Design a protein around this ligand. Structure first.
Ligand SMILES: [Zn+2]
Ligand SMILES: [Zn+2]
Ligand SMILES: [Zn+2]
Lengths: 70, 100
């Protein structure tokens, strides 16, 4: 976010954002969630509740966004 | 006269949030093992790492009223139990993790 050419929508940006990052293979996040959870929070990824996260990620990297943070 | 029951933009947000969450947890974890770390490819890491710092002390599911705490915990609880070999949202991350 330090520098940018233009703030405009595009194609293949999110698939590149996926293919060029690192995931939970060499190390993982299972330790911060604790030994016990609440199944009332459990659902399918295609059924997630995230409309407030939509506004956080609209501040930069995506296929189409309203702005780009410094 | 009404909208559909499902939309692909929800799959794009959960994938853009999941790929950024899995990065932010590895970013948070590797910091204690390295003398220095480079600037991340995702700018939202700054805003999401503050949610992770709360979440190391939170596990109450839907009881927490914090916006990102419940949606992040919902992703991790799925990640810890899903048959990721055939789940359509887990599948692309499962494949992208291998750089060969
Ligand atoms: Zn980071
Ligand atoms: Zn919480
Ligand atoms: Zn799954």
């Amino acid at each position: 976010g330090s520098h940018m050419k233009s703030t405009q929508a595009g194609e293949g940006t999110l698939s590149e954002a996926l293919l060029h990052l690192q995931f939970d293979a060499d190390e993982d996040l299972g330790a911060l969630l604790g030994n016990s959870t609440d199944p009332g929070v459990f659902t399918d990824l295609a059924s997630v509740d995230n409309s407030e996260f939509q506004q956080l990620l609209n501040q930069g990297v995506s296929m189409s966004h309203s702005t780009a943070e410094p | 006269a009404t909208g559909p029951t499902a939309d692909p933009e929800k799959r794009k947000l959960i994938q853009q949030q999941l790929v950024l969450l899995l990065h932010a947890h590895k970013c948070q974890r590797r910091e204690q093992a390295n003398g220095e770390v480079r600037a991340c490819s995702l700018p939202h890491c700054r805003t999401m790492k503050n949610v992770l710092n709360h979440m190391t002390h939170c596990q109450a599911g839907k009881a927490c009223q914090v916006a990102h705490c419940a949606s992040s915990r919902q992703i991790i609880s799925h990640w810890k139990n899903c048959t990721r070999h055939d789940c359509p949202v887990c599948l692309p991350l499962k494949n992208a993790s291998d750089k060969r």
